[PDB]
């Protein structure tokens, strides 16, 4: 009863960071060694756990958040970070326990002329709470004049396309990111490593 990590990492499509996807993983055997012992992930950070011993751990549930962002912002997916991604798109809590895994997907997710279907939130009145998701598209009031729902000089559409193109520099190429959160609740564990 293997956990469906293939469905998440080798997913048919990846979601926009502003609308990041969450899959709940429960009641299965998780083999992380296949994950860590590979060259496929540029980043494999973990907080509160050791990567070598993940197969020794037992959890009540796992949440898999996934999305695409630019490479230069992947460092922002960490406790205590600031920036457009952490502030307006996906915010990790200070006490996060879990792993953030990321890899360049230019070969899968770029198109000549730009993929405009991937978006991120560029403007927001306040920072997101941890694990909060905001999918609203209200016009952002950047100046003193009310916008009344009309796009204009100081009244911005709140989302922005990355426009990933294959000729971008590596720092500006698309990276797919999956954050696995390990839920620790006062209950019996249902997702454990191989016995």
């Amino acid at each position, epitope marked *: 009863n293997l956990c469906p990590f293939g469905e998440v990492f080798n997913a048919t499509r990846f979601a926009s960071v502003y609308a990041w996807n969450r899959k709940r993983i429960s009641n299965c055997v998780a083999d992380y060694s296949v994950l860590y012992n590979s060259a496929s992930f540029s980043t494999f950070k973990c907080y509160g756990v050791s990567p070598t011993k993940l197969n020794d751990l037992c959890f009540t549930n796992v949440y898999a958040d996934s999305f695409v962002i630019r490479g230069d912002e992947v460092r922002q997916i960490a406790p205590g970070q600031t920036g457009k991604i952490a502030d307006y798109n996906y915010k990790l809590p200070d006490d996060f326990t879990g792993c953030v895994i990321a890899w360049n997907s230019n070969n899968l997710d770029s198109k000549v002329g730009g993929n*405009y279907n991937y978006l991120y939130r560029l*403007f927001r009145k306040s920072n997101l709470k941890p694990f909060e998701r905001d999918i609203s598209t209200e016009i952002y009031q950047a*100046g003193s004049t009310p916008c009344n729902g009309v*796009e*204009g000089f*100081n009244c911005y*559409f709140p*989302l922005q*396309s990355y426009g990933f*193109q294959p000729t971008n520099g590596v720092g500006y190429q698309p990276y797919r990111v999956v954050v696995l959160s390990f839920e620790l609740l006062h209950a019996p564990a249902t997702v454990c490593g191989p016995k």
Partner: nanobody
Amino acid sequence: QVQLVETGGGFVQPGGSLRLSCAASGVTLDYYAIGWFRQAPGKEREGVSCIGSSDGRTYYSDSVKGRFTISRDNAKNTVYLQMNSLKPEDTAVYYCALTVGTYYSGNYHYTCSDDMDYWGKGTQVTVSS
């Protein structure tokens, strides 16, 4: 790489007219937004105008509405900006900048904010007697 060149700056008498031109080279994005910003002495850089490539929708600032006219070149990727009824406070360094557009719900949206993908060198415009 995308390069932006600004031309047409200089000295203009009060109440005169001018024509600034921004030429973009190496542009490969199918859809993009081109904005004109200005920085005046003693004031922080502020936006002036914004244009979308797909439809040419025109956005003007409150202080410049009705006086400055921005348009696109039909033949080449050059943006023209006609200055009319110039005033002494209009003296500033003007820059032309380009960024990628946004696609959502089958429609194209273009934003010209402080954070821009590319920036040009800019030219000085002085409105004085």
